[PDB]
Nucleic acid binder design. Structure first.
Ligand SMILES: C[C@H](Cn1cnc2c(N)ncnc21)OCP(=O)(O)N[C@@H](CCC(=O)O)C(=O)O
Ligand SMILES: [Mn+2]
Ligand SMILES: [Mn+2]
Lengths: 411, 555
DNA sequence: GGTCGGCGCCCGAACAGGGACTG
DNA sequence: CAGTCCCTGTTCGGGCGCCG
């Protein structure tokens, strides 16, 4: 008996038509049980080939979670409805969420199934379930309620969500709550003990309105990865050549970096392993270059109208560096990960973990997901990344192949 | 017209476009008799109905012979209607493979006679499916019908039939969960572990369940005893094989005959191990004429004779046992070619295959091996829904050195080393630190965009120098040439300093083959060396001999 | 015969995007 | 400075095979 909110595509755009990729046996069996139960509960209903739209579907398991979770790759549908969840029913991003001592993530995606979807828009939520060895044709479905993973679901449910959180926000005015996709970010400066207690108060407060899992964060402990120069008492020609090339590349970010006096030490055609003493002017140029790298870049600030871009570099030995920016050489944030799951054995699991950690930080700081430049081949990534995905959202990515230059982000 | 028991599928045209209006092409008098005989029988069965002059649409119609039968098949040239028909999403996601079949006690295969003619079409859409049957006389106005069922030739018929067929089989599969029904269009592969007594009953129950909706299962197409003819294979109780393949032998080969030859070789590669098409596919390149006669190269004739000798021996596959592991082993066939065998027991192959794509102008065996593993992984998930355990002709230490030191993220699933030459390895290793006691070469190269002239050379720490003029070259080719010069004129250990990101990025990827003859020469020199250390420095910064050698090669 | 859909392979042409140099 | 071009990779169009 609920009124449906009318939703339309962007002017001059059709629905998504993405082919379903092959799925493993454990994922298909999980999707059949889920889609049968969702069909029995009226959440989804079967359709036919007269619906020309389709969106891929697979299943995941969150961190330390045994239950399978249906996940739809609504990335193409979210692009074709962008003017809806930004212009009309936008969600504000609190700037104080990144400053809290502890932030917890709650999966509230099951609450979207309580609101019906606009009848004229259900045609675009179509998805197909594959079968092993193509025993049967594709079993197609479409959503009758607000789907999980669609950027229009939290916008429509925002009015219903605020009235559920109003009693809790009133009793706890210092706790910050942010909603992104199927996740609810609850942050507070409270002690770790009573913080989890306030989380359980919110879980029971949500169970009364018809809501589980907990992923803890600590944004105040997030550190950046600066550009560092070596500290050696005996420099060689090869050391100084690598030092000049690194400072020359870093000069694109810090315009005050100078390499004139250091290049004068490389005037002759010397052997690489030959020791070179640093002149008096070169020592001052290196020390001043170290002090510049401590200063923040001039004129770097986040623009809400610009997209976020994240580049990742493989540094070996389980080391992974990343930079987030909107304009080139104006990095809003740098960082480095180490000893993630699959370290020293699986690059794809390490890279998949890194993308999730980077995307989570971008949601807390700016409330936006970045487009990734992945250092991986397209076929290698599109073959394994679903085996390690543990998040209810999926960021956009492109594949790059940039051979290492002068190891700028890692000593 | 009676209502069909099957629920119709609502079909629309694309907005702002009318139905087709095409004139009927001339038919042979032997095809006209076949159409009038079929159109009269389908009209009696309610599959087509007459239309008056109020129907302004028309579409050509023809017919082809049925294979191994005297009956005919009615086809409509709906090429103009498909352009203006709404887009459909095909539910057929792939083709089933016998290597994915599990062993069952009983197996039954049955076809559906005139499958498209037993599924209704949307009443609001039957108008545009109008055709004209010409008579034996050109002056006779002819009889005009419209389709009340799914026509053959309309782009929506297969997608509608497959979804319609699935909806009819759903109540039977729901009541009989222990029955495996492989559904490909109308061809039904029914197998079960039930006893043979109850199996024939469930088969007859299925033949009666399909009969309630107008789907007839003729006893002519019924199959009760092995071998079963299913999807172009021969299914036996313990093995399977493809139906006999006939390679056409031609004294004079055309380009279209090569495409028909390569197509059957790719089809044979699914079970026949060791099929190559590298030399034969090299005949299809650079040629733009299907009917042009092309001579067979010496390498193409040898490759063809080897494929014919493989097709002489009989091969067979086995079925899938979910209780045992899946194993895939790869071998390095030729240069750029790879073959694999997927099996569970030794020499009992479930299926075979081959990989031979050339990705990039510069590659190595480890990259191509990684690409073959990924192709087999996705192929195995389609057929068996799981990733097999690999046996790879690459040392564990060799792979450990590659994936750890490579800048891209790369990975191979759970595998083990199988010692079957030729073994995949790395042919040279660039040092991570400069070499003590090795001559340091500062290389550089440049060229003019207009005159296409340039120089390339080096300057070393021991005073050695060289500059070579080059004609019809580019800045990239000269900088690659300068590194080649330093590799020629150096000892077994050499330190090279360049400012070319292009040249450095190619060499650091450790290629062993290249489309560029210059890079192949650089590779050959890198294998002869014992220690090579490459280093990059920025240009135009006055660094070492790189500035002195930049001014020497500037012209 | 020259109809449709699905999947596979092979090829070239068109497209797409970054270093390096020049007006 | 923007404009190229040299190089490389990707995507798509079209032929065949095979199945219904
Ligand atoms: C209509 C449905 C699918 N289908 C098969 N071929 C085509 C085609 N060329 N164009 C369009 N749809 C086609 O076919 C199943 P059927 O009708 O039950 N039996 C076959 C006879 C096979 C033979 O012995 O050759 C037929 O009559 O087609
Ligand atoms: Mn049939
Ligand atoms: Mn140069």
């Amino acid at each position: 008996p609920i009124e449906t909110v009318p939703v339309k595509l962007k002017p001059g755009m059709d629905g998504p038509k993405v082919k379903q990729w092959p799925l493993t046996e454990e994922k298909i069996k999980a999707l059949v049980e889920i889609c049968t139960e969702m069909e029995k509960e009226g959440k989804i209903s079967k359709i036919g080939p007269e619906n020309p739209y389709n969106t891929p579907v697979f299943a995941i398991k969150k961190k330390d979670s045994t239950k399978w979770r249906k996940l739809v790759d609504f990335r193409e549908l979210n692009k074709r409805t962008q003017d809806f969840w930004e212009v009309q029913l936008g969600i504000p991003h609190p700037a104080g969420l990144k400053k809290k001592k502890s932030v917890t993530v709650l999966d509230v995606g099951d609450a979207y199934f309580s609101v019906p979807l606009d009848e004229d828009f259900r045609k675009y939520t179509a998805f197909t379930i594959p079968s092993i060895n193509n025993e049967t044709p594709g079993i197609r479905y479409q959503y009758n309620v607000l789907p999980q993973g669609w950027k229009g679901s939290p916008a429509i449910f925002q009015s219903s969500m605020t009235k559920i959180l109003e009693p809790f926000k009133k009793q706890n005015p210092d706790i910050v709550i942010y909603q992104y996709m199927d996740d609810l970010y609850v942050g507070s400066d409270l002690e770790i003990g009573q913080h989890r207690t306030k989380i359980e108060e919110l879980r029971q407060h949500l169970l009364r309105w018809g809501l589980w899992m907990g992923y803890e964060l600590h944004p105040d402990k997030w550190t950046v990865q600066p550009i560092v120069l070596p500290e050696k008492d005996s420099w060689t020609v090869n050391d100084i050549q690598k030092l000049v090339g690194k400072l020359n590349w870093a000069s694109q970010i810090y315009p005050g970096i100078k390499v004139r006096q250091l290049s004068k030490l490389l005037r002759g055609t010397k052997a690489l392993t030959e020791v070179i003493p640093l002149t008096e002017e070169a020592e001052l140029e290196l020390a001043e270059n170290r002090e510049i790298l401590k200063e923040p870049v001039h004129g770097v600030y986040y623009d809400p109208s610009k997209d976020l871009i994240a580049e990742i570099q493989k540094q070996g030995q389980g080391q992974w560096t990343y930079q987030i920016y909107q304009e080139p050489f104006k990095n809003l944030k740098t960082g480095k990960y180490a000893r993630m799951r699959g370290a020293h054995t699986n690059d794809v699991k390490q890279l998949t973990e890194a993308v999730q950690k980077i995307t989570t930080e971008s949601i807390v700081i700016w409330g936006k997901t970045p487009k990734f430049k992945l250092p991986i081949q397209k076929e290698t990534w599109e073959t394994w990344w679903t085996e390690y995905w543990q998040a209810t959202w999926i960021p956009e990515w492109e594949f790059v192949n940039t051979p290492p230059l002068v190891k700028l982000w890692y000593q | 017209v009676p209502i069909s028991p099957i629920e119709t599928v609502p079909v629309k045209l694309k907005p702002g476009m009318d139905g087709p209006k095409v004139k009927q092409w001339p038919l042979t008098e032997e095809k006209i008799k076949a159409l009038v005989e079929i159109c009269t029988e389908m009209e009696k069965e309610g599959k087509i109905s007459k239309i008056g002059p109020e129907n302004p649409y028309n579409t050509p119609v023809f017919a082809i012979k049925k294979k191994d039968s005297t009956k005919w098949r009615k086809l409509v040239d709906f090429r103009e209607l498909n352009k203006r028909t709404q887009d459909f999403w095909e539910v057929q996601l792939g083709i089933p493979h016998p290597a994915g079949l599990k062993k069952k006690k009983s197996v039954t295969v049955l076809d559906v006679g005139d499958a498209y003619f037993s599924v209704p079409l949307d009443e609001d859409f039957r108008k545009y499916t109008a055709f004209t049957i010409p008579s034996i006389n050109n002056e006779t106005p002819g009889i005009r019908y419209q389709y009340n069922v799914l026509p053959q030739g309309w782009k929506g018929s297969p997608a509608i039939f497959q979804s319609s067929m699935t909806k009819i089989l759903e109540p039977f599969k729901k009541q009989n969960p222990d029955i495996v029904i492989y559904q490909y269009m109308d061809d039904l592969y029914v197998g079960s572990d039930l006893e043979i007594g109850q199996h024939r009953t469930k088969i007859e129950e299925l033949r009666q369940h399909l009969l309630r909706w107008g789907l007839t299962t003729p006893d002519k197409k019924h199959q009760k005893e092995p071998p079963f003819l299913w999807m172009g294979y021969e299914l036996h109780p313990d093995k399977w094989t493809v139906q006999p393949i006939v390679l056409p032998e031609k004294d004079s080969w055309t380009v279209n005959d090569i495409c028909k030859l390569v197509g059957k070789l790719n089809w044979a590669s699914q079970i026949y191990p060791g099929i190559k098409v590298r030399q034969l596919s090299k005949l299809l390149r650079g040629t733009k004429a299907l009917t042009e006669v092309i001579p067979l190269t010496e390498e193409a004739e040898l490759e063809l004779a080897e494929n014919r000798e493989i097709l002489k021996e009989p091969v067979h596959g086995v079925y899938y046992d979910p209780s045992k592991d899946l194993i895939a082993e790869i071998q390095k066939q030729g240069q750029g070619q790879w073959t694999y065998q997927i099996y569970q027991e030794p020499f009992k192959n479930l299926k075979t295959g081959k990989y031979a794509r050339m990705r990039g102008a510069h590659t190595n065996d480890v990259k191509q091996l990684t690409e073959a593993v990924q192709k087999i992984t996705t192929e195995s998930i389609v057929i068996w829904g799981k990733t097999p355990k690999f046996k790879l002709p690459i040392q564990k230490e060799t792979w450990e050195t590659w994936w750890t030191e490579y800048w891209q993220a790369t990975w191979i699933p759970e595998w083990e080393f199988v010692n079957t030459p030729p073994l995949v390895k790395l042919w040279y290793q660039l040092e991570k630190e400069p070499i003590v006691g090795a001559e340091t070469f500062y290389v550089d190269g440049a060229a003019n965009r207009e005159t296409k002239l340039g120089k390339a050379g080096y300057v070393t720490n021991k005073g050695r120098q060289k500059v070579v003029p080059l004609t019809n070259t580019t800045n990239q080719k000269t900088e690659l040439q300068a590194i080649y010069l330093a590799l020629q004129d150096s000892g077994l250990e050499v330190n090279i300093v360049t400012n070319s990101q292009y040249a450095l990025g190619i060499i650091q990827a450790q290629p062993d083959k290249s489309e560029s003859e210059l890079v192949n020469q650089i590779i050959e020199q890198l294998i002869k060396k014992e220690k090579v250390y490459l280093a990059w420095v920025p240009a135009h910064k006055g660094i070492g001999g790189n500035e002195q050698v930049d001014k020497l090669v500037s012209a």
